[PDB]
């Protein structure tokens, strides 16, 4: 039942279905900030700003997009990541978080980690605004609101406050489709109007590693 | 049960995710004659030559590939079809050809289509060498007739040998689908990194397009 796309096909979720390559190097120090803090808190790793800003490259496009396109991180225990991000002018719109080393997932793991998110999905429906978890969408439901209050809290610019409700009214008033492409579950929904997420799962590490949000 | 793709989702076949808009027009007679028959005996137009030639503007990438992006076309009762077509090495990996005023197909139409798919699909399956509403043997019979053309003329056959191919994916390989852009396409691969898609209109009930990697 777990659809997989083949070699044949590319999928390239929204914005970087806009994304030419002529977009410009442009630096932005509040977006600079929100990035390394959405790295810490959505990603997880421990870098410091000294150690990410000389790295969060963004690139501008006169479409009003900015792109970080494949910054390549190491962990202190060796694990290689590559982040990519994209802000539109409805802020954070695309966030990954890819460790490079993980391993292959079997069709069993894969199926497994599709039931399993069925049943978070499940779970979240019958309590969505819970009051110490597995869940896949607790967790990254608090990542996203831990993000929103430190930006908030540093007064800084909140790129993804302004998000939240979409992202969580979405997964609970649309139907929940998946598909599996390059050994993540991109878990999908929608609305009538055109707004549209993907949510992508992680079968190795059990959770969110990004998303991709289109109003 | 048929995946549909959300408005977040771009999905490119090969060799598309390859374009990169810095390809340069170059006119090649043999790549514009094969095209141009392409067009009328897989997509199925009555354009003569002389409507097509000054339209088929391929543009070649270092790569070794050859674009043509959206040529648009108007059929004499009034149809606007994109054309999109591309070669590499081992000749047209891409075509389609689309109408641009169809219907949406409702739910159920798409439920229907993929039904009838697999319908068309077994019978195949038992009969793969044998007048016919059969997508498989329609398409198949398409390139076949382009293949003999191109023979006639005495210029380079484009798709003879990746006619062997795809029809020995649909043979062998699993059937899976999913549905993009009001079409269902059906998707085949095997474990040597070799992967098709064939692009059915639930509308016009057959394959208008199709993309090979090897």
Redesign the interface.
Known sequence: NL????????????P??LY??QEQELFEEEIVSFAANSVRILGGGSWTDEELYPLIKFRYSGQDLRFLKDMALTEKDGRRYLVNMALDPNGLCYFSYVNQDEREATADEMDQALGKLQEDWEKFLSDPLPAKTDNAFYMFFMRCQMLSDQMRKEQYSDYIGDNLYTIWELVLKSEF???SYDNHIYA???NDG?????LIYSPIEERFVGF???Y
């Open positions: 659809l997989y796309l083949n070699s044949g096909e590319e999928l390239n979720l929204y970087w279905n030419t390559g489709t998946s598909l999908m929904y929608s055109g707004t549209s997420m993907v991709s949000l289109k």
